[PDB]
Design a protein around this ligand. Structure first.
Ligand code: CL
Ligand code: CL
Ligand code: CL
Lengths: 579, 579, 579
């Protein structure tokens, strides 16, 4: 089924909790010993109560896993696990005749195949985007059986591919929700300021069901807006509304109550309004020049470092970014859960939103492209009304090649065709064209609204001293945005500022690096890497990394490292300077 | 380097113990973020003592694993682990100038890449066959660094492929041995009775080194044999020796001390002599009709169910087969460690020896074929002097197809070209051509000396009662050998004989099944599945299987199930009847 | 209630396998929140079927543990666990009226409380001695429930007390066995040579039940012995038999089939005959002077280092002792399972058998004395017919005090009153009375038949050099027996002979220490510490001990360290010298 907008404001019933599970690395529940699909696999969820017959599994007496969640932090045996885990849930639901029922997954990494009562609903790939199935006519009276086959095996042709710098978190990682709808319902809608127009609200609305021609009212009571339209034979209607809304900023993240009521459905939202554009090397929010005082963040929890999903997780992480002095967060390297985006929206954080087109994607594979573009479409479709998002990012650290350029230009064009307002970015990389002279020479830059790139001078490229003896130049007059920078340190590990992975080295790096940043012309944003130490299978120094990337300014246990205050101090200066 | 015969009788120094290790699922130690090999990966074994520079690993402070051993039973985190683990060992060795030094791996599952002092020695695939490297000219004074990159990822094109019914045990699973040799050494030799000739010992010997033309003496003092030959320019010599040795049988497993002394090397062995052939439906050992009272055995330890490797493990397992009344063991589904074969040899067990050409091998892949044929050659080369081995098996439960038939016929022909004496087998499968009429209709049978097949009447095919109402017929007059049969049971789990996985069901099955076996014409051997419960990721019934195949007649904890005594009783009758 | 001789030869039914369990550190299933024993706790084994009522447990859906075994190696969470684990087993048994049924526990560490069908059978303390309950009248039709509350908390007043050098293995550590008896049955018997008499078999038989007065026949067919006696009203009869048995020896461990038959019961056994005495500083076996070429052994398995209990475990351990050249094993520091003693009996190992009166026992506590004495009686009663046992040991490394001497004197007197044949020992400790002069100055020695003591010159007491410079003297003329000596090494850890925990240090230590043993006047025995590395929570050197005592001559993975061959060589010389 197509995406449902604003799931949280619908008639929802959670299916979360603890589910029955079967770890199945050889996919015995799907394939027989000839490696063929067979009838009687684990999707049938047959309780093994008659022991005069033979079967090889029993959900009813197997172990549990929490849903939502990565499986990796739930059992020692699952820490590295890559492969199939079956999940099973029994539920009852009383669906009044004529109402519709949808099963919504916030995210499953990586491939999900879903059955209800032994009937296959469908299949999804892409670990960070939501998907749903209509189950209106498949629900039975009494106990219903939902089985989900989850597989997180790394595949060469997948998005992302077989190599990345974060943990391969498998499982049903975001909430599972039943959504009851009327027979014809408001499925999707868009309400935002028109491009560069502080005074014009535009949008549209899309109905789904057999009664597609209806009157619809868009209601913004605080703005005394009440616009009525009628949908066409395809259930669609658009609108233009002149209005002077108070404009959302990080300092005053104003949101308006927005109500949509058609004849057969109604839904409420919280939507803010703002204009965003570039002008030369300036980033203009509501026509005012801003600096993006940012920090990068992975979708991983404080303290126990599982996959984040809740408002609790988001608020804690963003409260650290608040203390750091940020007005901006880079959510890397994939769409985060919706609670993170919404909490950024209400607390006052501009957002960079990204799909995992990351490192050595298979640029020549047409299935790979369709998967990436599908993830692009789903990312924008979910969050198109989140006014704090100002940058869509289509790639991170991808090698230069002709097929790669073609691949990403198609993505950039698709992004613009879907959203004319927000800026298009991508984490490019730097080059030292001559000793001491750093720049970004990437043909991808021509398709981007900003010169966005990662650089690690003083960590990967030289010792801290090298920050002091380089300068930057750019051959185009677009805002410069450094989307990653920094260095590693273990909290509580102290020593000389020359000794790597001590807090003192990271502090000294941040001092010299900030001084370098202050010499860069056109610099309009920084999202250093990273807010919190996070899990990566590429970080193997014992007692220092222990499978964590240690470039947090905050430890995984919520402790602010020395370098945190260096960046906080610079962000205080930028706050005053951009007043 | 080519195989070394009889490693245990050489000047050996063990490298076993506990080694430094790095779990590396994304192969960060081999590939950089562009997925390219890079200089400075983990093979350099650089101790991270200078922290003014950056690296991402440190063997010196990482965790240990035992060598030899699967990694799966050593850490909860490694239970399911499929991927790369790096192993590192530091050692010293004082090699007198002019002597040679070889590094011998008994087995590594699945792919091994080996470095010494940062220099790549080579690479091996195939998890159950030995391999060695000459390190004579790479050894340094003082500390030497040996790094082994072990990967057990399942590959479609591998042997075995992505599906099998036993645990994917990764690691350095058999001993690691340094072998010192003289500058020209006896590398390989063969000493066995000529085909069907109780009175003629034949063989050959192969030298390696710059002094290949030498006098060689074959010494069997108890037989008063002293035959002298000279090798040719390629270091090879053959021999024929008339003699009347006492012939090895299971009842009197007579072995002779055999000494080989060339001018530059000498090695001793323990070798027995016997003739084996078929005659119609009879299997003839030393011209006497025998029945193979067998049991199948995986290479997995009693009690803790790790990969077996020691004489302790072998003796315990074979002591159970002894108590069961066996004169024969089927070592499934791959070459076992040499201690198992030798202990079978000295205790009096005929042996079926197999390579893992198992289920859905990629018959059309020429690399797949070469791997299978290499494993075939290595299996025979290692154990060609073990007179208790009488069957080489080239496949198990492979689907019928033309490319499969071609693949296996090439294997069968290669086997015969290497060894004219032993019988060629393969686990075929049965078919019910008409209700109640069971047979084996497989074109592979024409290439085999026996009608060897697996059947599970009363477990997979019907309830126990079905054993009572079927009969078998075969359209050729070759000995019938049932290489698998039986059913599952949890030790200490009791109930009605109708209830599957109880001891009583397995007992009732074995009674009815044995009665069926007694009606089969031409039956000359049975190796029921299996001696000991063993680990399989296809066995998911909670509290009953718990990732174990439960078809043992002995539990994984050494407890004899009721059905053990049913088969023991039949084997007692067959012992008397074949006197 | 009383001990049953020779359980394995009775009509037995195993209850072993996998049992339901509840870990209960606060003993919630036994005490209420007023810390009062309550009724309706876990021993009722009430399946939680009716969820309209409240309870806080459910065996029926809880986790399994293997029975027999320690719990510590079965789950990571139970590695260090000290406290209560509840065990539950369901079974059926059909008992013809008139017959009796007993429940036999081979051992439970440390305290066991036992219920059948919700009714308390009794309680046991002492982790290494067997105990029985009669359940004849409490057996119900259908499902019977057996619940065992097992606690291994260390207690100051217990035997052993709150400190020892081995792992606190909790659980049902040896088999659980149902024993069917006739109404009047042969409970106990003794059949051994009279003291110092090669020709007189003496003994006695003890019946229990309502018809204790019966005719008894003792048959030893190979000796053509057939003796009839009639028991008295207490069920007792003694006998004296002239015979000329082949005397049991390590080199020829001759055992006889012994058959006892009453009017209503019969049992068979395998029993050997030997004499043993001291003569000044000599130990005489069958009048012949012997040296006890020993090795100490804990009751811990090869490879996985759990609690040993099976014939497999015993055979593997003793096969290392055989290869070492031993004729003697010290089973420390408590009664081992019967399989170990029987396998030593049949393979030809003299045995030292011990109770865990170890270190700082509470000598003034009368309950502590009764417990120690009960363990002494139980040890001797179970194994009084094992001719390979020649030393009972009453203590190990206990501090000198008046009350300690009284305590041990009472045990020595009790031992002698139960067994007038075997030697009484205890591991005393050495004293450096003058610099360079070592002796044993412990008044306990007057109560022992041998001067048995532990000494660690070259490990705890000096470096290896000290072995070269010290002299020993002894004031009495009793055989000197060194019951512990040696040092630690990790297999595969190599370095200078002066680097402790290398194989080379341990090898150098044994070379120098063996030389010292040659100049100890009166030395008649050595059982160095120890055969196999074993678990101890007092051994904390990371990557070297890792919670293992490393004084094995064999690693816990079955690998012979360099020092193994030093002791083996000396034992080969002792074998020739004592021919
Ligand atoms: Cl880092
Ligand atoms: Cl099974
Ligand atoms: Cl130690």
């Amino acid at each position: 089924a197509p995406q449902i907008m604003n799931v949280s404001a619908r008639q929802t019933t959670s299916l979360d909790g603890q589910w029955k599970t079967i770890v199945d690395p050889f996919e015995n529940g799907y394939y027989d010993y000839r490696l063929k699909p067979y009838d009687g696999g684990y999707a049938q969820d047959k309780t093994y109560s008659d022991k005069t017959k033979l079967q090889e599994y029993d959900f009813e007496t197997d172990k549990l896993l929490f849903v939502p969640g990565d499986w990796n932090t739930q059992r020692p045996q699952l820490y590295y696990y890559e492969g199939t885990v079956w999940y099973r849930k029994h539920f009852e639901y009383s669906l009044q005749p004529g109402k519709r029922l949808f099963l919504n997954f916030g995210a499953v990494n990586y491939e999900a195949i879903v059955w209800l009562n032994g009937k296959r609903l469908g299949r999804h790939i892409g670990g960070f985007t939501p998907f749903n199935f209509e189950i209106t006519n498949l629900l039975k009276e009494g106990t219903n059986s939902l089985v989900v086959k989850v597989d997180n095996k790394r595949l060469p042709e997948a998005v992302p591919t077989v190599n990345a710098d974060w943990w391969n978190f498998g499982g049903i990682t975001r909430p599972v929700t039943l959504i009851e709808m009327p027979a014809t319902y408001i499925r999707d809608y868009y309400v935002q300021l028109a491009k560069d127009d502080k005074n014009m609200i535009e949008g549209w609305v899309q109905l789904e069901g057999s009664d597609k021609e209806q009157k619809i009212t868009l209601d913004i009571p605080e703005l005394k807006v009440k616009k009525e339209v009628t949908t066409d034979a395809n259930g669609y209607a658009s609108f233009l509304i002149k209005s002077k809304p108070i404009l959302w900023t990080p300092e005053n993240p104003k949101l308006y109550a927005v109500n949509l009521a058609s004849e057969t459905d109604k839904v409420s939202d919280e939507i803010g309004f703002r204009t965003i554009r570039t002008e030369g090397i300036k980033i203009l929010l509501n026509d005012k020049e801003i600096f993006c005082r940012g920090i990068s963040i992975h979708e991983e929890t404080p303290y126990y470092s599982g996959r984040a999903y809740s408002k609790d997780h988001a608020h804690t992480l963003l409260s650290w970014a608040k203390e750091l002095g940020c007005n901006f967060v880079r959510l890397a390297h994939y769409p985060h859960n919706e609670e993170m985006v919404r909490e950024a929206e209400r607390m006052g954080f501009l957002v960079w939103s990204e799909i995992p087109v990351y490192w050595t994607i298979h640029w020549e594979n047409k299935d790979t492209y369709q998967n990436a573009e599908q993830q692009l479409c789903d990312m924008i479709a979910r969050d198109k009304n989140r006014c704090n998002i100002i940058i869509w990012s289509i790639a991170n650290e991808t090698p230069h090649s002709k097929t790669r350029l073609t691949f990403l230009s198609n993505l950039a064009n698709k992004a613009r065709s879907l959203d004319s307002v927000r800026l298009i970015g991508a984490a490019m990389e730097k080059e030292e064209v001559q000793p001491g002279v750093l720049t970004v020479n990437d043909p991808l830059g021509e398709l981007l609204d900003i010169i966005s790139f990662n650089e690690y001078v003083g960590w990967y490229d030289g010792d801290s001293e090298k920050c002091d003896r380089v300068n930057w130049t750019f051959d185009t007059q677009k805002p410069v945005f450094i989307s990653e920078l920094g260095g590693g340190a273990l909290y509580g590990h102290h020593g000389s500022p020359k000794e790597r992975f001590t807090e003192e080295y990271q502090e000294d790096l941040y001092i010299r690096h900030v001084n370098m940043l202050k010499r860069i012309p056109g610099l309009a944003g920084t999202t250093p890497w990273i807010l919190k130490d996070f899990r990566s299978p590429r970080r193997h120094v014992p007692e220092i990394q222990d499978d964590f990337n240690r470039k947090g300014l905050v430890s995984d246990k919520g402790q602010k490292k020395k370098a945190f205050f260096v960046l906080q101090k610079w962000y205080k200066e930028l706050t005053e300077a951009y007043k």
